[PDB]
From Swiss-Prot:
Residues reported to bind a divalent metal cation: E46, H54, H56, D104
Domain notes: There are 3 rolling circle replication (RCR) motifs. RCR-2 is probably involved in metal coordination. RCR-3 is required for phosphodiester bond cleavage for initiation of RCR.
Family: Belongs to the geminiviridae Rep protein family.
Protein's name according to its UniProt entry: Replication-associated protein
Cellular compartment(s): Host nucleus
Sequence ranges assigned to domain CRESS-DNA virus Rep endonuclease in this UniProt record: 5-113
Subunit relationships: Homooligomer. Interacts with the replication enhancer protein (REn). Interacts with host retinoblastoma-related protein 1 (RBR1), and may thereby induce the transcription of host replicative enzymes even if the cell is not dividing anymore. Interacts with host PCNA. Interacts with host SCE1 protein.
Section covered of the full-length record: 4 to 121 of 359
Upper classification of the organism: Viruses, Monodnaviria, Shotokuvirae, Cressdnaviricota, Repensiviricetes
Function: Essential for the replication of viral ssDNA. The closed circular ssDNA genome is first converted to a superhelical dsDNA. Rep binds a specific region at the genome origin of replication. It introduces an endonucleolytic nick within the conserved sequence 5'-TAATATTAC-3' in the intergenic region of the genome present in all geminiviruses, thereby initiating the rolling circle replication (RCR). Following cleavage, binds covalently to the 5'-phosphate of DNA as a tyrosyl ester. The cleavage gives rise to a free 3'-OH that serves as a primer for the cellular DNA polymerase.
């Protein structure tokens, strides 16, 4: 009846068993346009206990972005003719992002984050 429409300032992409690198995702994500504006970009890789390679992404736009289409975050393999459909998730938190941001460790840092208000 309804449609998939997400509206949040924070968005998290999850790629299950995705052999996609942070560089490719960083380039694709970075090259990924938005109706708002891309501020900070945090890409961290994580492997599941299932032995499947997972990737984590955390971006924060200056304004609330409407992710009512899972075609924008559509990442494909630039080395293989395979497409991947990441799961878009809206962070109901605000600063909580900073908490996770602190949790560094072999990750790609792009852009500069800025918490509006205190």
């Amino acid at each position: 009846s309804g449609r998939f429409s997400i509206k949040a300032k924070n968005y998290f992409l999850t790629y299950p068993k995705c052999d996609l690198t942070k560089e490719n995702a960083l380039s694709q994500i970075t090259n990924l346009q938005t109706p708002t504006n891309k501020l900070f970009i945090k890409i961290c890789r994580e492997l599941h206990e299932n032995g499947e390679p997972h990737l984590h992404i955390l971006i924060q736009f200056e304004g609330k972005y409407n992710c009512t289409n899972q075609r924008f975050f559509d990442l494909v393999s630039p080395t293989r003719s395979a497409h991947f459909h990441p799961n878009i998730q809206g962070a109901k938190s605000s600063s909580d992002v900073k908490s996770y941001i602190d949790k560094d460790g072999d990750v790609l840092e792009w852009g500069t984050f800025q918490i509006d208000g205190r």
